[PDB]
């Protein structure tokens, strides 16, 4: 239960613009969105759920595509893989 939260003191991945990464549920991901609107992408198969930290709650992804999230603030966003059944490679983008 200890270091369960996501956040700036914490996070263990840090993801670049556009580019995939291996991924598990658990992980804090650090992502910094410029500007528009947050994209989360994954074609492994392998369904996923995020939190982003003092943002949107409960984003799901089928593992198929894109998951746009609105709302989600420019700046540097803490975002928590919540389950995942598998190790997947995800990336996130902004447009
Ligand atoms: O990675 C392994 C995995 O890849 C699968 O292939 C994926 C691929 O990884 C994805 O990148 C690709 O997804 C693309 C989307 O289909 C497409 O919609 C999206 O396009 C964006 C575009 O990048 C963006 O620039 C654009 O923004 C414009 C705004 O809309 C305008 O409002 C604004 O004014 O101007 C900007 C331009 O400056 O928006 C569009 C959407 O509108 O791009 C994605 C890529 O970046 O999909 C592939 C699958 O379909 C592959 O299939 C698997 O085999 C493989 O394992």
């Known amino acids: 239960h ?3 939260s ?3 003191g914490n996070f263990n991945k840090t993801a670049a613009k556009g580019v995939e990464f291996s ?3 658990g992980d804090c ?4 969105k410029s500007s528009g609107t947050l994209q989360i992408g994954s074609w492994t198969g392998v369904a ?3 939190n982003i930290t003092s943002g949107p709650q409960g984003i799901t992804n089928t593992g198929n595509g894109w998951t746009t999230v609105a709302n989600a603030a420019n700046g540097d966003l803490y975002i928590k893989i919540v389950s995942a059944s598998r190790s997947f490679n995800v990336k996130f983008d902004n447009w």
């Open 2 to 4: 200890m270091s369960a």
């Open 6 to 8: 996501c956040g700036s």
């Open 23 to 25: 991924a598990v549920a």
């Open 29 to 32: 991901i650090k992502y910094n």
């Open 48 to 50: 996923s759920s995020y």
